[PDB]
Amino acid sequence: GKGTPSFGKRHNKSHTLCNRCGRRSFHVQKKTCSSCGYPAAKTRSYNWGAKAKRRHTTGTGRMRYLKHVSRRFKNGFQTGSASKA
Amino acid sequence: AKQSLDVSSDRRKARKAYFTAPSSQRRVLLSAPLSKELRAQYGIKALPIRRDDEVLVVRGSKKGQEGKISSVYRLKFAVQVDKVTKEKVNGASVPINLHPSKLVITKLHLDKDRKALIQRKGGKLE
Amino acid sequence: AAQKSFRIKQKMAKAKKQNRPLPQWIRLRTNNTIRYNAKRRNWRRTKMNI
Amino acid sequence: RSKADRMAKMERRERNRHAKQGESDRHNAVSLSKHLFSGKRGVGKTDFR
Amino acid sequence: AGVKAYELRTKSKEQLASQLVDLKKELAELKVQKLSRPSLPKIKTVRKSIACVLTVINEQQREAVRQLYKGKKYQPKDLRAKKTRALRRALTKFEASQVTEKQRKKQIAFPQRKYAIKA
Amino acid sequence: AMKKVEDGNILVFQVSMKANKYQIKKAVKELYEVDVLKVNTLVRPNGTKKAYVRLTADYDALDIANRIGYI
Amino acid sequence: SEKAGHQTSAESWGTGRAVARIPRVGGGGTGRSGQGAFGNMCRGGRMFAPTKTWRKWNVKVNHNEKRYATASAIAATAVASLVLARGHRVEKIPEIPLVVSTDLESIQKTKEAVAALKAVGAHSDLLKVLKSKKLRAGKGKYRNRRWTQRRGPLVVYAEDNGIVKALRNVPGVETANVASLNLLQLAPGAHLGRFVIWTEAAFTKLD
RNA sequence: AAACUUUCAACAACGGAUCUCUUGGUUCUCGCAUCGAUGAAGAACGCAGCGAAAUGCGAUACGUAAUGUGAAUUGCAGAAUUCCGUGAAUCAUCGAAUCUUUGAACGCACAUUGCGCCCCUUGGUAUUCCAGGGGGCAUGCCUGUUUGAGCGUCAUU
RNA sequence: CGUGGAGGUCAGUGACGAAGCCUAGACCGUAAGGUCGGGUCGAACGGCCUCUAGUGCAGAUCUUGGUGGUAGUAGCAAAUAUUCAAAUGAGAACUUUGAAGACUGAAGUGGGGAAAGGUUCCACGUCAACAGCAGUUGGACGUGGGUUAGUCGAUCCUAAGAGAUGGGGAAGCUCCGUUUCAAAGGCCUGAUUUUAUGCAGGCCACCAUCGAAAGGGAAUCCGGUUAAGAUUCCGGAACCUGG
RNA sequence: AUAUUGGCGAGAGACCGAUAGCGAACAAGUACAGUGAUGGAAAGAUGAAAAGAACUUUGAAAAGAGAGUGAAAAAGUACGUGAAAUUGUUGAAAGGGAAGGGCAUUUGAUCAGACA
């Protein structure tokens, strides 16, 4: 009566998709996300969860802008354009 | 021997920088030596292979056969000379890959830039 | 759910377009290690979890 | 087309030996389940009929 | 093939915008033919021709605004330098070169001399 | 879709997702110079917006469909 | 690595009959779940006694004893029955130690220096090398140590004037100053008597 | 006696050990200092002539521009002028651009592709109504400006 | 004695077959083990003096992987039940049409929906796997097609309640609080002929926002049509809100 | 001058060599499980070159037998080497409620050495 027949009553979602992390960890009644700390201003992480940091450090995604920084440093942050030598 | 720090003598560095070499650096790797006919003519030992050159095979099963290069196939580090093929059993024909360190050039194809390369490296051309 | 929202429906359109086998000409390329589609979903077996 | 149709049937074969009912059956078999073996059954209420 | 960039740089502004619309009529008509043909590889070249015109129209307006604000303080933010965040918030070459008026009198009278110990 | 051209006097187009009924009613009138009675839209299951455009009774759907070319 | 094997949250199930006490990986559904972890005998576990960096790598040796062994390494080069016992095809040269004039130091090219090494009598000992290059025996091939070979004569000079660059290429040959005199060169593999060619200005400096 | 059970060999199976490989790791040393309100890291969806993914990219979408190298790309189809040249390509470099919807996230809101307002402008006989196109509207604090408040308070009629 | 590497030596062995693996074939050592012949094989590997360790397995209800005996065995026994002929097919107890026979019996095995699933709905091609027998059929496989709204819903309002700002705590991430010890905010006409808005000058004192696809709620019905959609499309006839 | 398991660029090792080494040599923080915080694998090797078996005949087809490519199909997309458990056929041998072992010989199979 607590096992397989009352698993059949389970059809109301606790969590929905979060906007910041896209994780399906957004608790509806608490209005907050368990995984990525939304809507608070800081991304939730802890040093007890070390594996949770490796899943979401920098470099894990696209790095749309940081992949072009050290190339700009190696030239020394130049402007203008080429001269056609 | 090695007397610098910027060069590497590591097996695992040198193979990975060969197999994942970009397309423009594969031009230099697929160089072919000139014949002693042309070596007296220009005074230069080796040149990167181009499409329209004429060549002679000197090592392998196809030794002694010659032709014009159809297309340089840098993705496989190989070059497909026409009239050097395996005819299949079903009538079709398949070109045979060759590596250009074993080829020998007897006729060059010259653009403006091929003249500018030979004048650069110490040539004599005419 | 027959009264769905757009955010859920946009993810159903992505799971439909990924629901296909692998094309035949990728078999023939040079240094192909790809043999089948290893990320294939089916509605029958594995629920996509929203 | 008949060459790549053959390369489908040369590489489907490993999934049919495991009787994959598609190419999308990747239900993973657990080695050992906890509720079968992790207990000491004594006098009183137990975990199954 | 398609258009060349350097040929567009000689044309006027009214002729660039007319060049753009004439490509977009072609790109609309090749997508009608795409369902009739099994393959139509030409639609790549007319598509990059749309990108080549839009770069030139953008470049000619961004060079026209720099002359509108040349010789003037506070030019807009996307025309300024990008360099990075914490280098923009820094002391300039003027301000870090500044020193108080007392130290200016010190460094003239007593600078680090040049000398040597042999004889 | 060709069955709806002849009886319905209706063209069928595919429309970018951001557009609405006022822009389909405006752009069809501009590009083909053919007035629009009503526009109906929906979102396909594959993720793009379809639009049913019914031209007025003056303008015929077959003769415009030859000028664009699909038939 | 210090954290190898411990990237797991395993825990013992307890004491059933049909299971051991080695702490099982929790969770379910992935096939990893329910396997042993954190043991040395488990698959994918850590090893016994993870080897740390602060093992004693270098050995301190007494300085007076280190000077002692370099002295006994030199005095075996004269004896010349030990030199044949190590290798070094020196059966044709008349006297050992060989002393060559100081003009050996001032040679600039490699082609001239080999002709100097042939005419003193080190011909076959040069040719003992270059007949003897082989491959390494095991897994030392793809650890940047692929080829192995024998050693050759050792040339001692007083003052560098181009002999160290001339003999830098030719295989087997190792040149050495008098002030240095490496023990790792005079007795390779703790065998006395490497065949040494001396120069004259180096030999009178040895007092 | 056959069958059957057991033992060993031969060849054939099941199974993936051994031996040999290696674009991966691991530790050690040296050189350098560079993320973000000029919208970062992260996320969502989209992009190819034929792609599901990895890698790349943002309606200019496996890339546009500038420069260097100077004939390819390749599984196929396609392009021959694009080959003594302002010029090939999934090349190399990178100093100019685009940068969807989000995110500290910033008009308010968000389980919604919800709901306002201001300016410039075009169409609908319209400053007011409806729609399209372009541009704006968060909070804390500092310096400056402008308009103010208080019998806090001074002079002056 | 044997194992993985290291320094040295045998100018050691090797595509004329190195290492491995099999071998009721041979030889040596009391033994650890060593050597040789044969078969298989396809690229590197040994002897000897020394150095170094992640150096020797039958067990730990050992770890991972693989295979047996039991065994062609237990079993596939709830829900009243199947039968004949033809077509299709290499093949039919199971597919398809027809002829019979039965059941659910309007608190159904019928016709629509809410949570929930996500293309399963429909057509075409087709049977290696899957439907614990079968298979030509399928909720399987391969390729395509399909969801149309001024009126149906969401959006809007408030319920129990969530929650910023002004503030007050807190070392701090953050806590209390909902009109509070706060200077909290915009309408309505004019009068105009710089025409745009001066001033006329009154009134208001309330003051975030989120919270129901079942409560509250502006307004649509009938007949046709699709392989698959309709209070949405077509034909016909109405009503509502902002202008 | 000092610190540094992170970011970027380098150079090396008496280290490990696919149950090892990071969890990951491979579309790995991926497939998959959980409401959730989080948990989290398996998976490298045809050949020098696809020259990936045209064609013939049996079969409804998968495939089989030939032919052919190749140095090698005792390398055929289940692909380098393919060990043991376990199994099939053939050949030998034994056998009344076990089997296996020790000393000693018979019979049967098999085999090296030496006699110039």
From Swiss-Prot, chain A:
Its cofactor is Zn(2+). Binds 1 zinc ion per subunit. Zn(2+) binds at C18, C21, C33, C36. GO terms for molecular function: RNA binding; rRNA binding; structural constituent of ribosome; zinc ion binding. It is found in: Cytoplasm. GO terms for cellular component: cytosol; cytosolic large ribosomal subunit; preribosome, large subunit precursor. It holds the Pfam family Ribosomal_L37e. GO terms for biological process: cleavage in ITS2 between 5.8S rRNA and LSU-rRNA of tricistronic rRNA transcript (SSU-rRNA, 5.8S rRNA, LSU-rRNA); cytoplasmic translation. The keyword rRNA-binding applies. Its main location: cytoplasm. A zinc finger (C4-type) spans 18-36. Keywords: Cytoplasm, Metal-binding, Ribonucleoprotein, Ribosomal protein, RNA-binding, rRNA-binding, Zinc, Zinc-finger. NCBIfam families: PRK04179.1. HAMAP family: Ribosomal_eL37 (MF_00547). Component of the large ribosomal subunit (LSU). Mature yeast ribosomes consist of a small (40S) and a large (60S) subunit. The 40S small subunit contains 1 molecule of ribosomal RNA (18S rRNA) and 33 different proteins (encoded by 57 genes). The large 60S subunit contains 3 rRNA molecules (25S, 5.8S and 5S rRNA) and 46 different proteins (encoded by 81 genes). Present with 21800 molecules/cell in log phase SD medium. There are 2 genes for eL37 in yeast. Belongs to the eukaryotic ribosomal protein eL37 family. This is Large ribosomal subunit protein eL37A. It comes from Saccharomyces cerevisiae (strain ATCC 204508 / S288c) (Baker's yeast). The gene is RPL37A.
From Swiss-Prot, chain B:
It is found in: Cytoplasm. This is Large ribosomal subunit protein uL24A. One of its GO terms (biological process) is cytoplasmic translation. Component of the large ribosomal subunit (LSU). Mature yeast ribosomes consist of a small (40S) and a large (60S) subunit. The 40S small subunit contains 1 molecule of ribosomal RNA (18S rRNA) and 33 different proteins (encoded by 57 genes). The large 60S subunit contains 3 rRNA molecules (25S, 5.8S and 5S rRNA) and 46 different proteins (encoded by 81 genes). Keywords: Cytoplasm, Ribonucleoprotein, Ribosomal protein. InterPro entries: KOW, Rib_uL2_dom2, Ribosomal_uL24_CS, Ribosomal_uL24_euk/arc, Ribosomal_uL24_KOW, Translation_prot_SH3-like_sf. It holds the Pfam family KOW. One of its GO terms (molecular function) is structural constituent of ribosome. Component of the ribosome, a large ribonucleoprotein complex responsible for the synthesis of proteins in the cell. The small ribosomal subunit (SSU) binds messenger RNAs (mRNAs) and translates the encoded message by selecting cognate aminoacyl-transfer RNA (tRNA) molecules. The large subunit (LSU) contains the ribosomal catalytic site termed the peptidyl transferase center (PTC), which catalyzes the formation of peptide bonds, thereby polymerizing the amino acids delivered by tRNAs into a polypeptide chain. Belongs to the universal ribosomal protein uL24 family. There are 2 genes for uL24 in yeast. It comes from the Eukaryota. One of its GO terms (cellular component) is cytosol.
From Swiss-Prot, chain C:
The keyword Ribonucleoprotein applies. Residues 6-19 have a biased composition (Basic residues). Pfam families: Ribosomal_L39. PROSITE patterns: RIBOSOMAL_L39E. One of its GO terms (molecular function) is structural constituent of ribosome. It comes from the Eukaryota. GO terms for biological process: cytoplasmic translation. Component of the large ribosomal subunit (LSU). Mature yeast ribosomes consist of a small (40S) and a large (60S) subunit. The 40S small subunit contains 1 molecule of ribosomal RNA (18S rRNA) and 33 different proteins (encoded by 57 genes). The large 60S subunit contains 3 rRNA molecules (25S, 5.8S and 5S rRNA) and 46 different proteins (encoded by 81 genes). eL39 interacts with YIH1. This is Large ribosomal subunit protein eL39.
Swiss-Prot record, chain E:
It is found in: Cytoplasm. Its main location: cytoplasm. The modification Phosphoserine is found at S12, S49. The keyword Nuclease does not apply. InterPro entries: Ribosomal_uL29, Ribosomal_uL29_CS, Ribosomal_uL29_euk, Ribosomal_uL29_sf. One of its GO terms (molecular function) is mRNA binding. One of its GO terms (cellular component) is preribosome, large subunit precursor. Disulfide bonds: none annotated. Keywords: Cytoplasm, Phosphoprotein, Ribonucleoprotein, Ribosomal protein. It holds the Pfam family Ribosomal_L29. GO terms for biological process: cytoplasmic translation; maturation of LSU-rRNA from tricistronic rRNA transcript (SSU-rRNA, 5.8S rRNA, LSU-rRNA). Component of the ribosome, a large ribonucleoprotein complex responsible for the synthesis of proteins in the cell. The small ribosomal subunit (SSU) binds messenger RNAs (mRNAs) and translates the encoded message by selecting cognate aminoacyl-transfer RNA (tRNA) molecules. The large subunit (LSU) contains the ribosomal catalytic site termed the peptidyl transferase center (PTC), which catalyzes the formation of peptide bonds, thereby polymerizing the amino acids delivered by tRNAs into a polypeptide chain. There are 2 genes for uL29 in yeast. This is Large ribosomal subunit protein uL29A. It comes from Saccharomyces cerevisiae (strain ATCC 204508 / S288c) (Baker's yeast). The lineage of its organism: Eukaryota, Fungi, Dikarya, Ascomycota, Saccharomycotina. The gene is RPL35A.
